[PDB]
Structure formats: C-alpha cells, structure tokens
Symmetry: C3
Subunit: 331 residues, 3 copies
Amino acid sequence: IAALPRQKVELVDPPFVHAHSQVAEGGPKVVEFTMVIEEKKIVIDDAGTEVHAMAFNGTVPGPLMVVHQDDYLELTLINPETNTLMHNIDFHAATGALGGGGLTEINPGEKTILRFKATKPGVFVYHCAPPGMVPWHVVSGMNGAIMVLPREGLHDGKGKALTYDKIYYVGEQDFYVPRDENGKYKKYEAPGDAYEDTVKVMRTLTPTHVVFNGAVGALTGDKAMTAAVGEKVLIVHSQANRDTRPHLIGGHGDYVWATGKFNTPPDVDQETWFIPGGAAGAAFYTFQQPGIYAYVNHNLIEAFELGAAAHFKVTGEWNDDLMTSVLAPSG
Amino acid sequence: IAALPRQKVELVDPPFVHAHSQVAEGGPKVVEFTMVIEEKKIVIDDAGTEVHAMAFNGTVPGPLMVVHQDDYLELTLINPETNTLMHNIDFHAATGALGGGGLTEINPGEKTILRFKATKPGVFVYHCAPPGMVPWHVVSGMNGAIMVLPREGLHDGKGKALTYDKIYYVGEQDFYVPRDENGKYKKYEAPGDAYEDTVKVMRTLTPTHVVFNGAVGALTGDKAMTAAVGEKVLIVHSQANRDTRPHLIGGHGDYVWATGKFNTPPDVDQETWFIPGGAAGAAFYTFQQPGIYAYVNHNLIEAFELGAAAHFKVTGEWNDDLMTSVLAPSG
Amino acid sequence: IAALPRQKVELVDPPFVHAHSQVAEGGPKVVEFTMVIEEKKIVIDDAGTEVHAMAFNGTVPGPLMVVHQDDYLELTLINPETNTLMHNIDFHAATGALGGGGLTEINPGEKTILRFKATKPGVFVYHCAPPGMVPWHVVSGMNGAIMVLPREGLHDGKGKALTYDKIYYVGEQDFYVPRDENGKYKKYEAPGDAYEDTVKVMRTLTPTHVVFNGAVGALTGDKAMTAAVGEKVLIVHSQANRDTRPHLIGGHGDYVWATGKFNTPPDVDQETWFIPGGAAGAAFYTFQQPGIYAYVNHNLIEAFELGAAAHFKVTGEWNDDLMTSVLAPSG
Ligand SMILES: [Cu+2]
Ligand SMILES: [Cu+2]
Ligand SMILES: [Cu+2]
Ligand SMILES: [Cu+2]
Ligand SMILES: [Cu+2]
Ligand SMILES: [Cu+2]
C-alpha cells in the first residue's frame, strides 16, 4: 500500500461535490481527506429556532467524499480543543470495527487517521456514533455520505454507460427541538444543556423539523440547484436516521439506485423512490423542460410544513409536445 | 397532433375502472377526460365523523384514468363557482410545469384544458397542489391515479404477457380530524374554518383515519370486491401522502410492480409489498381458493383500528391440496 | 399425498433454528410441528416493565419453522385450558382461508391441526389474527416466521449456490405499554384488563419499546450471536406489524432478499435494508473482520433508546488491508 500513489482531495460544502473523475483515471490509490468537527449553533427556520449542531467540516450534512472501488480512503479527523464533546466516525462503506467508530474516538484536542478499503461500490452514509450518545450526535446533524464509484463509472442494468453532467448532494435531517410550556422552541447556552430535553422529544419519534442541507429553505430561491434542458444530473440523497421518499416535482428519476448500491440494478422511470433511514440513494435524470422544479420528501406534510423542500432552476426551451396549456385557466 | 385520432372517455367511480383495452388498439391518440372538482362534506365512519373533502369528480380517491404509452391525455378541469377554493392538478406521469400544476391553477368559476404526452409506462399518482396549501388539499382527498399501459399490454420480467381479467383501483387516504376537549371529532361550517386545527393535527404526522375509497369499511360488506377462482386480477393502489404496505390476507402478490413502473421488472411471490407516500403500485394475482379475503395495509393498527381494510368475496371450489383442516377445533 | 413421508421436527427457541438441510434431501414430505400457546407475563426491559404476552411455543417471537418448497406443513396448535383467550394462526405462506386463520380459531382447552402446501419459496410471517382483535394479539408478541427453502437451496442472481454456515432468526416486536399520570408503566392482573388502555396507545402509532427476541438487550452481551471470520451467516428478520430497516454496524448485507422472496433476485452490497410491517426478509453475509458488531433497526432512536439493538461476537484475525488505524487518537 506504501507504493500506492496518494492524492489529497479538497472538500466542498454540500450540495456541491469536490472535483473527481467518473471513470477511474488509473489504478487504486490512497485518497486523503481531512475534516474538522465543529460544534456550532445553527438557526434552522425563519422563527429563529436554534439547534446545537455537531458538524463535519462545519456543515450539515458533512461533505460528500468521492473515491472509486478498491481505493483506500484515508481520513484525518480532528476534534478541536474548542469543542466540548467526544466524537468519532462510522462509515457504512467500511468493513470492521463498527465502520471505524471503535478506532476513531477523539476528545477535544485530539485527532486520528483511519484508512479503509472501499471494497463495495455505491453511496453510503457516514456518521458519528459515540457509545451511549449515538442517536443524539446523529440527529444533531453529525452525518454525511461518501460515494464509491465503480472503476469504469456508472452504468445501467443492461451495461450502457451513464455519464452525468452535474451532481448534487442533498442531505436530509430530522431535528427534534424541545419546546417550553407555551409552544415556544427553547434555546440553550451549550450542547449538553439540551440533552435531557432533546431525548424526551426524540422518544416520540416525531421530528419538529425535517430539512434539506441544514435549514428550511436552505436550497430554495437563489440557493436553488441549477441545470439546463438536456443536462444529465445525479442527485445523491441521504438520511442517517429516518426514512424519506424523494420526488422531483415536474420530473422523474430515470434511473434510481434506491438502495444506493451500484451492483444492484437501478429502478427506472421512478415517480417517487424510498430511502430508509440509515442509507443513501442516487437518482439520475435528464431534464426535458425548463422552469422551476421542487425536489421534496413526498410526505407532503414533511415537505411543506416541516421544511423538506428544495428547488431546481432549469434553463432552456419549453417542449409543447410533452405538455401544453390547450386552454389557459379561463371562466 | 391534430391529425391524431381523439376519444372521449366517461370516467367511472373507484374501485371500478373505465373500459379500456390492454394492448393499444392502433396508433397514438388523444384521450380526453373531463373532471369537475367538488368541495363537499363526507362522513368517514359510523360515528358520523365528517370531513370537508376536495374531490376530483366528486369521489375520494379521484377516478383512475387509463391511457397507453405515447398517447396524449387531454384533461378539462372545471372548478365550479360553488367552490370556495382555488385548485390545480399535478400529474406524476407528466413532464414539466410541476406536473401540470403551474399551468392549471383555477379559481371557483374557472376551467382549463391541459395536455401532456404519457411518455413513461406505469401507474402514477395525480393530486392537487396549490402553492401555500399543498398538503391540505391532498389530505382532504384531492388525489387519484393514472395508469399508462405499455402499448403491448403488461408483461412479466421475462417477456411472458400478463393479461388480467379484472382491475380494481384502491385509493388509500390518511385523514387528520381535529378533536375537541372530550376527544370527540369536531365539525365545521366550511373547509376554511378547519384549516388551523387541521394543520395542528397534520404536524403530529399521525392520521386519525386511514381509509380505502373514502371511508372506514367502504369496501367491505356488499361493496366488497369480487373475483372467482382462476381469475387474474390487477389491483392498483395509491397513497399520495404517506407510506402503505398492502397485503392480501390468504393470498399473495404473484407479480408486484411495487414502485408502480412497468419498465421495472416486477417482484414475485410477495407476501406484503411497500408503496412510498406519493406513489402508486400494482399487484397481479390469480385466485386459487374461494371465500373472503381481507385486503389491508399491514400495519394492523392502521388496518383494523384506523380503517385501512377492504374485503374480497371470491366464488369457486375449495382446493384441499393447497390447504385443509386435518382436525377442526376440538377438545 | 397420503403416501408422502412424514417427519416430526422438534422446534428450538429463537434466535436459534431447528435442524434442516438447505438442499432438500428427498421428494416432498409432510413436515409436522406442534406448538402450544402460552399467555404469560414477561419483563421487557431493565426497569421491570411487564407485558401480558401471548406467545406461540412460549417465546416472543414464535419459533422459526423450516420446510422446502412443495412440502406440506402440518401444524398441531394447542390452546391450553389455562389460557383466557381464543387464538388462531395465519401463515402468510399459505393460500386460502385467511392464511389458515379461518380454520384454526381455538378456545382455551382446544387444539386443531392445519395442513397447507408450501408453494412459494421465501421467509414469511405467521401471526395470530382473531377477528376483532387482530392488532392486540399481534402486538402482544403473537407472531413468528417460517422459511420455505427452494428444493435446490439458496442461489444468487445467476444461479450460484449460496450455502450458509449459520442461520439466526431475529424477531422484532413493537410494544405499546400504557403509563399512568405519573409516567410510570402500568401493570394489570389479567390480559383483558390492559385492553382499553393498550388500544389508546396503539392509536398513537408510537411504540414504547421496539425489541429483538422479546426484550431490551435480549441478544447482547452473553446472549450475543456468534460467528467467525470466514463464516457465511443468514440472518432472518421479521416484523408482523411495523416497518424496520436492519443494519449490521461494521458489516453489510452481501445478498439481501429484502422482500424475503427467493424467486425475486437479491439486492447486493446493502448497507441498510428495509422490511415493511407484515413481511420477513433475509440477509446473507460473510464475516471478514473479528470483534463485536451491532445489528440494529437503523432509526437509531428506536435502536438505542427503544431497545432494537443486538450484538454479534466474531472470532478470528484482523485484516489491516480492509481497515487500519494509521494514527490512534492522539494530541
Ligand atoms: Cu459526534
Ligand atoms: Cu449507522
Ligand atoms: Cu385543491
Ligand atoms: Cu406530487
Ligand atoms: Cu392470539
Ligand atoms: Cu398478516
């Protein structure tokens, strides 16, 4: 492995993904990533509701990491001195020691380096899982995903290559914010102060917010993801704790690896797919019509009342053969 | 498209389906449908619980429309002056303008005509989706399904054609009825009056009723579906807002397009299948034994406490080889 | 049929499975099983919470029965005079009379014998279903699963035989235990006394406990399942009433018949699979690394707060190629 070429990769904040090649450029290499854990307060809605996030690289969700099958992913995880809690990381893509969790427990002021072989292709969830406080770290936003591309890039069930023009990473988070006796969300001066209260809400299994990329409207308006008619887009989606049912309003999932494993053939022409909590999935789509599209968790209450809605702004020419207003709304 | 043949279809109330041919007769055509939206109070159980439904063509679910791949569906949607709300329609089978929702917003007293090419084969959900009040209209019964059949009819995963003798459309609905101080269901003069309270229930993500065809027991008793031993039946099921897990008690789902897409090979020998909220699915089965069968959502609490149960009354001869009581209940 | 060989099989309590051959050793035979129903009080957590269980063979879940496709399963069901309720059994594997539910309704002091032909291969759920009290009996622990193996044993997508060295049956149960005004779980003298209170909790659709093998921690520590590096393990998992998303922390599901049906090709390299309420599924995995593994329901709140977590204790040598701590947690 010492003789294997190494390469440092720079991570970019979601929904964007760091530079990479779909088809493996050469042979197996050791790909290096460094992430710093940041315990920070984040405002998740327009009412000012705060959540003491625990974030990888400072964002919720943590960045998407990309390697190819059989490469080695080497991660330098750092838990700064300014943090108050112990943290670790669990890659569902790895094999052994609880996905690496048993080998990466670092307290504030510590760091560690873990190397694992990306033996299985597909998109996988990764997240913090500290013994005794596993769900809390996860629902505080401490999770992300990694994509392990096949050496020869993406393909459909029947062997045809699927090359994408754009890739977006949508991380869905369920938050459980405690309320005081008047229905007002509470605020705390430190992460640990919220624990006891958060656990009570978690047990009801009913989130107060379900958001994409850390906040209500995070990916809407001018933060909308963009594409153009004719462009091929791969949308990676993950949920480390609760189920979701993604749906592109106005579009479809031409090829969907709902389970997120590339060795399992993709479902085609999907209207709404399902991604169970603890997994990541991927949908490939070629836009045919311009305009705005809403990407949502299709439990519409979760999408429109809880916050799970994002936008796609597509430029191009309308196709009247596909759809047309024969008679505009008139009396 | 004007040179294409056109055909008007008269819709039938669920669980029945309007006459259609499985194999597309000739070439593409423009299939025309007309639906009138009706805001009406419906009683959903024996206790007299009422809901202010928003019903396509007056029923919950709305009727099933059947077209073939590459046909054009031309829908004339009418929102009567007697209605108090604006409505529209989003077809999951359509490409562009939020499934047609952006092009069909009509106020009471208005009408519009939309046309789209049915490009992908499968069963799809259609529902109302007015900006700012999407979940409210959907959970008020404003949803249904469309079936876009392959021009050569259905086929199993490996070519064998699958021809059904009967087709039933079971639309499943999650309702959120507000309760008063005594735990009794509230009643309002108009739909608008129910909004705030309904919204509070919706946010708990817990429905008060989960019904088939608009009411608890709507498809039991003499309204039970019928078949005969040897009959091939296709059961289309849809849930526009939340997940469901259909199961035929005493039977199986021989071929199940759980995602509802015909270009995706069906699963076979299914005991219980899953349909994510915002999608429709289809299960094909050939009856082997006579008697009553219960068709339910297999979270038995939703099925027997909340209302998600229907019956099948099948005639024919008992097959002792398949099953027999060796010793009837005795001392 | 009458000339068919008969065979009495002695059942063992889960997670263990009675003796069987993966490849059918002869032609069809009538496999005979006997189960006694026991209504008993069980403690489901470390806080002494009691539940009046209704258990097939005295366990929660009921034992796993293994037969081969086209064999006949003849079950003798006994409901002792000491019991207080009528019970029956519904096999999702059977065809007719509600899975046998309509032919096996026995009052305390009665027995019955049912025979059915196991026509479809896969793992299926079986549960009690007394008309008008279906959910209550099922959520009181009265369910299990049966495995109908293909005559030629298990196979992957392209006819490659998959032979397991070990098999474990994890039965997951959702309990709904009432609480008094003080938030303390309630205890009852007889099962029937708990009915009214239990049903009001069931309607919230939120379980108080979600356990594996009848109790929190039932398969952890000294009761952890065992395997070694190199062994191929088949894990059968069932949930008769509610969805679950199994995940082996530190491992994967190399082959997963998520739907539990062997005629439906398995998904591969799964990180987390989904089993809808009312079905059984099976995952095949070959251990590569030693140590402890946690097998959980991946909604981590249900796993670590509600009780749905088990362990695997694996012996063998560590593979540093797959994973290695490059720099142990340091300053
Ligand atoms: Cu952490
Ligand atoms: Cu995990
Ligand atoms: Cu509407
Ligand atoms: Cu929709
Ligand atoms: Cu029972
Ligand atoms: Cu059942």
